[PDB]
Each structure stands twice: as C-alpha cells, then as structure tokens.
Design a binder for this molecule. Structure first.
Ligand SMILES: [Ca+2]
Ligand SMILES: [Ca+2]
Length: 250
C-alpha cells in the first residue's frame, strides 16, 4: 500500500513587495492525499530558511532582487514534495537605476529639436522611483521632432536591453514617441538606428509608460552611441514629458 508523496504548492501576497515589507506565503492548498502534512520547510532564497507545522508564514526581504522561494512539504510518513516560485523585491525608497537622477543632475542629458524646442530640468514634481527624475518641456511650432539625448561614448554593450520610464501627457500635439539608441562611427559616416516606436494612440496618457529597447548584438562595441527619447510633433503646442529610472543590467 505505497505511501503517496504530498502535493506542495504556495502563493504569496503582495505580488510585488518592497524591501522590509511583509510577504505572506500561503501553502494552504498543499495536501497529503493519503495522510497528513507534518511540516512545511521554506528557503527564502536570501540565505534564510524557516519551518512551520501550519501552511502560512510571513517574511521580509532586506535587499532588492529576484529570489527563488522553495517550499518542501513533508507528510506523516516522511515523504516530501517541493514547489519553487520566484519573487521580485524592489527598493522601498531610493532609485538604483543606471539613470536615477537622485543626485539632482541632468546626468549628461541635453535637448535638441527642429520646428520644436526642448528644455530639460531635474525635478521632484514627478518621479518613477526615488524622489527625482527629468522634466522635459517641449514647445513645438508645427510638424517637427524633439530629442532628449545623451552623447555618447560607450553607453551599453551590444545585446543590452534598456528599460525607459516615460510619463506622457494627454492632449499633446504629438504623433509618436520613441526611445532610441544610435551607434555611429566617430566621424558620423555610418549611423545605426535602433528604436522602440510607440504611436501616441498606443500609449498610456497621464501615466508612466515602461518601454524597453535592445541594442542588437552585432553592433560594433567601439562605436560611440547616442541614447535618448525622440518625439514627433504634428502641431503647435507646449507639453511636458517626465523621464526617470532608465535601467539595464551589467
Ligand atoms: Ca502521504
Ligand atoms: Ca529617480
């Protein structure tokens, strides 16, 4: 009459915790079909482990990151099963992004445009993470283009996915917006255009938009790079875009 191993499963809340916030892990749908569960053993993925004879446990992560949480459930006869899930923890305060703007600086960012003029300041009015970000005000005179840009030595290695956060307002005279990275030879004889084109109708207005962009792997790693955000304007008008927490790995 061979013993069946118990079934191990858990969920957690909140789905998106911050550092030092309580997460409740709930293994209550775990079950032994032919006996009872004796205990629940948890590995929180950060160096700490814990056990309970009951299916819930609460836990706090001190540092941001992505943790693998492994649950082992053991029945009254010593048979066990495991279930592993991932939890992402973000910083409760501050902003550790590659471009976080928390030092009050422009981070080397400048503006340019044609049939449009941009100004950029470091602001506390809106931020995606931390207390600060960029506030980019564009005055367009009609059909044109405006850039918020960083020149442009070697910003990222080829293959890198960048994440931009952009607060886009409603009722703006814009057709499209696009984060871009533009590698070029030092003398501009060869230029590569990489961008994530978003139409103005395909955008969350009066809200933060998370847009990713990959620099392709086959780009020459020695080429200087311009990274930025480009807006296409379609009519006269003044509008303000917020930019913060531009981030990538390595
Ligand atoms: Ca059993
Ligand atoms: Ca920030």
């Amino acid at each position: 009459p061979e013993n069946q191993a118990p079934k191990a499963i858990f969920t957690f809340s909140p789905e998106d915790p911050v550092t030092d916030e309580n997460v409740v892990f709930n293994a209550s749908n775990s079950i032994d079909e032919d006996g009872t569960i004796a205990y629940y053993v948890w590995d929180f993925g950060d160096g700490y482990e814990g056990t309970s004879t009951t299916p819930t446990i609460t836990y706090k992560y001190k540092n941001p990151g992505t943790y693998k949480v492994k649950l082992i459930v053991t029945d009254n006869q010593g048979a066990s099963s495991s279930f592993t899930a991932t939890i992402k923890v973000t910083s409760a305060t501050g902003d550790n992004s590659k471009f976080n703007f928390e030092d009050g600086t422009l981070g080397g960012f400048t503006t340019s445009g044609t049939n449009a003029t941009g100004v950029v300041v470091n602001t506390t009015e809106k931020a995606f993470k931390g207390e600060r970000g960029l506030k980019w005000t564009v005055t367009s005179e009609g059909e044109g283009t405006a850039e918020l840009k960083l020149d442009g030595g070697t910003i990222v290695v080829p293959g890198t996915t960048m994440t931009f956060r952009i607060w886009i307002p409603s009722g703006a005279p814009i057709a499209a917006i696009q984060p871009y990275i533009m590698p070029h030879t030092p003398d501009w004889s060869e230029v590569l255009w990489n961008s994530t084109w978003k139409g103005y109708t395909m955008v969350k207005t009066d809200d933060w938009n998370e847009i990713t962009l990959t620099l392709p792997e086959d780009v020459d790693p020695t080429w200087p790079q311009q990274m930025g955000i480009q807006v296409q304007t379609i009519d006269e008008g003044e509008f303000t875009i917020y930019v913060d927490a531009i981030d990538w790995l390595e």
